[model samples]
Target chain A: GGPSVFLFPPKPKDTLYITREPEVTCVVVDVSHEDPEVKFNWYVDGVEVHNAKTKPREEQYNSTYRVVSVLTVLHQDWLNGKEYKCKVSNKALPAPIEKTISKAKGQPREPQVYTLPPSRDELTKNQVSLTCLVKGFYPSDIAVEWESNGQPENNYKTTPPVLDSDGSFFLYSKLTVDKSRWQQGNVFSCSVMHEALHNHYTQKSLSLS
Target chain B: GGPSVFLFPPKPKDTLYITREPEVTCVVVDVSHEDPEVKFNWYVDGVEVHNAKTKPREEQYNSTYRVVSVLTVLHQDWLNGKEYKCKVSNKALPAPIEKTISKAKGQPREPQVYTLPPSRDELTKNQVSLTCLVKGFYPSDIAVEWESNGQPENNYKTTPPVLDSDGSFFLYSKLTVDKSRWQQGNVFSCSVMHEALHNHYTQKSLSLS
Candidate 1:
């Protein structure tokens, strides 16, 4: 009742380690149904494969019966781009309970983050603008934020990620600040949140220095 | 055939000089259809005041007759909330031409401009951000722009004007830049364009300075 799920290697990779245990394992745990006929089945792209090992355990807690089952497959078929599925069944259930997961391929790249200050014309006019450039970040889920003089500055803008000529993701964000206060030694910050950094983020700062 | 116009001072101000002419003028010029019957009428809040002056002039250029007419109102009524309208009519016109202008009230405040450089954290992370602040400006129509290394940068964002508690407006804009290039001596700029500034704009710049 609480999210029956499929657990498996999510994608195909030729680089899979031969010395490693390449297995797709699906689990149905803490099931309270008391049935000697409880079954855990495995399927690849909809057809059943019966040779997978199904480990079953039964326990009686107080007045109720609980069952746990795990299905494992060497899943060499996973490398061929197939849907690996898990189905848990009991006779007391009205219909077959199934969850399916398709192989997903992912490629993530860390973005190069940079920030720029206002130009001669802009500063001489007594206004200031700050820019943060995020380049080569893959996917569109990156975030860029700003802080000024220790205060989280809002109303900053970010552009939608664009595909670079080499196919990397690219975007930029801009912010405004007080010029006199900035020259008086206010600090401004640009933080980039991306998956590639060691701490999941990289930052850039701009100031009078 | 072009736009018929009511060239009236757009608003009534307590600061208006009593020695200055306080008049609403409307004009229909370069009328080629020669007619002595051309009339220019003035109205206040839909009601016509008969004493308003209509100045008519006529000339003949190469045989075709032309007329130029202007309607003027002392418009002392402009101090109150009312619709000022001008209607021009001629025997040859199938319909009377009308133009209306509502008095507008305005108070503009110059924005204080500033630019902030990146903070210590951001700079140490090899990224940079610049900020431009424009505060206490009136109205939402102000323009905020950025230029980096003398080139215009886009994807910058500005927020809608917020009404400050004191009846002024508040907003800021920010920008992004490449930290490496910035530290290597690239200049970035922020410009604020508003009616209250002496030259229509105030700008601030940030760089290695």
Candidate 2:
């Protein structure tokens, strides 16, 4: 039997565009069936992009099948006001699913970074809690990562972005590194990757001794 | 006007029960008004338990209020086929919100720990990626954390438990630390906290030289 198919843009934005640097956008198509035999086609400004690649994955829970197909576009060609779309056709679906990325109706502001060290009372735990507050961003498609002593720190928790009155967003990412590392004078940095920026990312750092 | 209210348990299991050791279960009640005035009560087996503290918090986004009330119960009192519940009452709702925890249909199996180090291909990255796999556990509520040189480490990610075919569950927690620390003979340990164990958690350690 065929399955029902649903297509959605990865980012929660009304309209989408890219920066001068290479940016990637993903369109996810999910089908509900054990064997979802489907084909995907990608288009930019109504022109078919044949070289596009789709990543297919499947999962089963409680004997029910879930198939997921992801179409990825990597390049600056999707910039400007051009429309990017993904089309999917499957045996179970009566009609193909098509979803497009149009320019957002409003301009999204890039996120700003701030650092807050753990309070004095928290120092008794012999650990330094460094919280990176990322504020005033839009479209909520930003990555905030941590680095300690020039090495990537993947052990951290990041909150989901909260929408503001004017459509801007704010969030926080906190890292608790060893207080000994901080006392030995380690450098901790918060790196932000946003769609509005190209080539380089915005970073804020603190050196604790 | 006040917003809507919702209450739910975080885990996916059908029946919820803890073990002999002291364990904690949380009942989360969320009310949707920009300013939610609510009260919480805890009951065990339909009888009220006094001095039970509830942590209430509030957040506002774009003039909409969201109130979160967390009821934390810590002890073995929640075991032995007993029922635990959280009740919520607010001015915005006509009826109170009450959620309960029922006994599990089956017995819970204790966990076994396994370790998987990063591949040889990843060695060039100058960091060691260590993963701790906890398997054969029951009652999805468990804690997996890391420690370095006997000091608790809080910066890590643990995936939700994946249910096995026979009702057992497995999960993974990963930590990427500097190779220099490992080479210096620092001890890294993965500790699992569950109700089936007492005094100390089940830990698997790797001491590098």
lDDT of 1: 0.61
lDDT of each: 0.61, 0.60
Q: iRMS of each prediction in angstroms?
A: 8.6, 16.1
Off by over 4 Å in 2: A1-209, B1-37, B52-59, B64-74, B102-105, B198-200
Per-residue CA lDDT of model 2 for A1-209, tens digit only, reads 24444545444221233432232344333455454466778787888877655555544444444545444554434334457676767666678777776545467676756665554434565645566666567656667789976789865666566664446766656576777877777788988777565432677886652
What is every candidate's C-alpha DockQ against the true complex, given to 2 decimals? 0.03, 0.03
Provide the lowest-lDDT 10-residue window in model 1 chain B: B10-19
TM-scores, one per candidate: 0.32, 0.46
DockQ of 2: 0.03
| Model 2: docking quality category | incorrect
Cα lDDT of model 1 by residue, B43-139, tens digit: 7788886666665454446444344433344434543446777787866667878888654445667777767666444576654556665666764
